Design a protein around this ligand. Structure first.
Ligand SMILES: *[C@@H]1O[C@H](CO)[C@@H](O)[C@H](O)[C@H]1NC(C)=O
Ligand SMILES: [Ca+2]
Lengths: 53, 39, 53, 49
C-alpha cells in the first residue's frame, strides 16, 4: 500500500490516523509473488522476529 | 522454519509468539503452550 | 422440498484444510478455499471452500 | 517415511457452458432469398444459388 492507517474504537466516535510511508515488500527469491504459495522450496531470508528477546 | 527466533513450536507444529508461551491463553488450540509451564 | 434442497449435506459434513496464512502463519482451518472460478461475465465469484453451509 | 503425491488434469466444471469449438470448413454453398415479381405475381422465394 501507499500509506498506513491505524484505528481503534473508543467509548465514542472511532479514532483513526494515517501517515504517509512507502510500503513495498520484496518477495523472497527470484520470483515476484504477492502472497506466499501453498507449496515451494525453502530459501534463506531476513525477517522481523516477533520474539521480545 | 518459522519466524526465527521465538516461535514456540506447538504439538501440532504451529508457531505462536513467544510472549504467549505460558500466558494463560490457549493459543496452540491444543493447550500445549500452557502445559508443563514452570511456576 | 426436492432432493436439491434436501441436499447430500446430510451425508457429507464439512472438513478442514491447510491455509497458507491464517493471520500469524499457516493452520488447518475449515475456511480453506479449494478452488475459485471466474468465468462469469457479470463479475460474480464462485468460491469452493472446504466447509459447508 | 513415505508420502506419495498423485495429481491429474481434468476438465473444468464450467466447460459445459463456456467452451470453444474447433471446426474445419470446406465446399461452401450459398442460399439466397429473392423477392421475385413476374407479371404482378409477388412471391417470397427461398432458393439456392
Ligand atoms: C418484396 O419483399 C418485401 C418484404 O420481403 C415486401 O414487403 C414487398 O411487398 C415485396 N415487393 C414485391 C414487389 O413483391
Ligand atoms: Ca498461551
Amino acid at each position: 500500500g501507499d500509506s498506513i492507517t491505524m484505528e481503534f474504537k473508543k467509548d465514542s466516535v472511532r479514532h483513526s490516523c494515517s501517515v504517509p510511508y512507502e510500503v513495498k515488500f520484496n518477495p523472497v527469491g527470484r520470483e515476484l509473488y504477492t502472497h506466499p504459495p501453498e507449496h515451494g522450496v525453502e530459501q534463506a531470508c531476513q525477517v522481523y522476529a516477533h520474539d521480545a528477546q | 522454519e518459522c519466524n526465527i527466533p521465538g516461535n514456540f513450536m506447538c504439538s501440532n507444529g504451529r508457531c505462536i509468539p513467544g510472549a504467549w508461551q505460558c500466558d494463560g491463553l490457549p493459543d496452540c488450540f491444543d493447550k500445549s503452550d500452557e502445559k508443563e509451564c514452570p511456576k | 422440498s426436492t432432493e436439491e434442497l434436501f441436499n447430500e449435506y446430510k451425508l457429507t459434513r464439512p472438513y478442514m484444510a491447510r491455509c497458507i496464512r491464517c493471520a500469524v502463519g499457516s493452520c488447518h482451518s475449515p475456511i480453506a478455499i479449494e478452488a475459485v472460478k471466474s468465468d462469469g461475465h457479470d463479475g460474480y465469484v464462485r468460491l469452493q471452500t472446504s466447509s459447508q453451509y | 517415511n513415505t508420502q506419495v503425491s498423485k495429481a491429474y488434469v481434468m476438465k473444468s466444471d464450467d466447460c459445459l457452458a463456456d467452451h470453444a469449438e474447433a471446426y474445419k470448413a470446406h465446399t461452401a454453398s450459398v442460399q439466397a432469398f429473392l423477392n421475385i415479381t413476374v407479371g404482378e405475381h409477388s412471391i417470397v422465394t427461398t432458393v439456392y444459388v
